[PDB]
Amino acid sequence: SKKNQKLAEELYKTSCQKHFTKTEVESLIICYKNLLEGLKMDRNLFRDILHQKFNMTEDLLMDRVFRAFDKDSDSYISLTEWVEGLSVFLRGTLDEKMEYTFTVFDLNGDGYISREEMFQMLKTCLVKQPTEEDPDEGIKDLVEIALKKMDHDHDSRLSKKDFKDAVLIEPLLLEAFGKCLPDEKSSEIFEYHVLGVK
Amino acid sequence: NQKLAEELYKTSCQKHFTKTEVESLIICYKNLLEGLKMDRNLFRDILHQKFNMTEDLLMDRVFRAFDKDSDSYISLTEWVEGLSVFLRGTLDEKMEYTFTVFDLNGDGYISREEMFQMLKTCLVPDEGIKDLVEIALKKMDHDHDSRLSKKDFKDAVLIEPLLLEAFGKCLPDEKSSEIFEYHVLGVK
Ligand SMILES: [Ca+2]
Ligand SMILES: [Ca+2]
Ligand SMILES: [Ca+2]
Ligand SMILES: [Ca+2]
Ligand SMILES: [Ca+2]
Ligand SMILES: [Ca+2]
Ligand SMILES: [Ca+2]
């Protein structure tokens, strides 16, 4: 409490998160500590949290969300990564969110969401829960629809500019390639129970 | 006149135009009219020439959605209300409209066959369409009855955006919209 208030003062000061108050940071620190199994928040713990708290169930996208959280790529979510991540994930502006979803969707980190990446991401839900018949021609149709709507220069990939321009025009395209933000009900429940909002 | 525009702005359910814009739409309608009323043939030519729709099935369904009283003419009020949704519609307005277009028999469920015929006409081969239909049901059919109820469809909004772009071809593309608003309403 003294422990956590002083930690919260320091993290509120140092963290780049833009949306929690210092008291909310303290609640987030306590929550993190209460969720820890071992000393560090690893992939498997973070996966469980996404599944249980945010109803995400699909392996590829959960891994991509983890990687976006894990800013320094050490395969652990630090306290400051937990706050900063959740700040965007729960409260981000469109701008923040578009940068986040682009990062999720750019599977190899080369700066472009490629046709191939689109196909992998769109197919991954049907790998998990298959239709009776192979769905690949229909996925390819969706990929072409995406490219038609979003690829300005017809090079079969979306630059950051391609994606953000299109999402600003149609914000429903924010998560075009899969669910990587919490639905409104999940978000509300976590805010209410963990942060006391509403 | 102006009086029609005063009356229509007061009376109409359209949500997105100003009274001056309404007046512009009334003048537009009258500038385009060929006889006394806008019938299906004229309405189809407008969809074809100004909004880049090419297929008979699609154009018939858009007509029927604009023709709310099913009298086979597009009244001034229908033209304005339909264009309000069509050019500036909210998500809810657009989903309602797209559901209307796709639910061919008007029973309140999009069936597999309705979805296949309408995706096919919207996206003008069949292998991808047949897949799309199975994908949509797998993703959106909550109660597993092989049909999309209106709730099935509307709950799917924030969950399935690219699938909703497929269905959204009954609305005009951004390019066609912009050009019409620019010419007729004086917008960017
Ligand atoms: Ca880390
Ligand atoms: Ca990439
Ligand atoms: Ca197939
Ligand atoms: Ca491009
Ligand atoms: Ca009528
Ligand atoms: Ca039906
Ligand atoms: Ca159903």
Author numbering:
A (entry chain B): 2 to 199
B (entry chain A): 5 to 128, 136 to 199
Give the article text.
Moreover, we found that another Ca2+ ion is bonded between two calaxin molecules in an asymmetric unit. Compared with the open state, the closed state exhibited the inward movement of the α7 and α8 helices and reduced the exposure of the hydrophobic surface formed by the α7, α8 and α10 helices (Met122, Leu123, Cys126, Leu127, Ile140 and Val144). The residues (from Phe172 to Cys181), which formed a 3-turn helix in the closed state, relaxed the helical structure, resulting in a 1-turn helix and a longer loop between the α10 and α11 helices in the open state. Phe178 was dragged by the movement of the α7 and α8 helices, which relaxed a part of the α10 helix in the conformational transition to the open state and induced a C-shaped groove with a width of ~10 Å.
Recently, an axonemal Ca2+-binding protein from ascidian C. intestinalis, named calaxin, was demonstrated to bind to a heavy chain (HC) of outer-arm dynein and tubulin in a Ca2+-dependent manner and to be essential for the propagation of Ca2+-induced asymmetric flagellar bending. Based on the amino acid sequence, calaxin belongs to the neuronal calcium sensor (NCS) protein family. The crystal structure revealed that calaxin was composed of 11 helices and contained four EF-hand motifs.
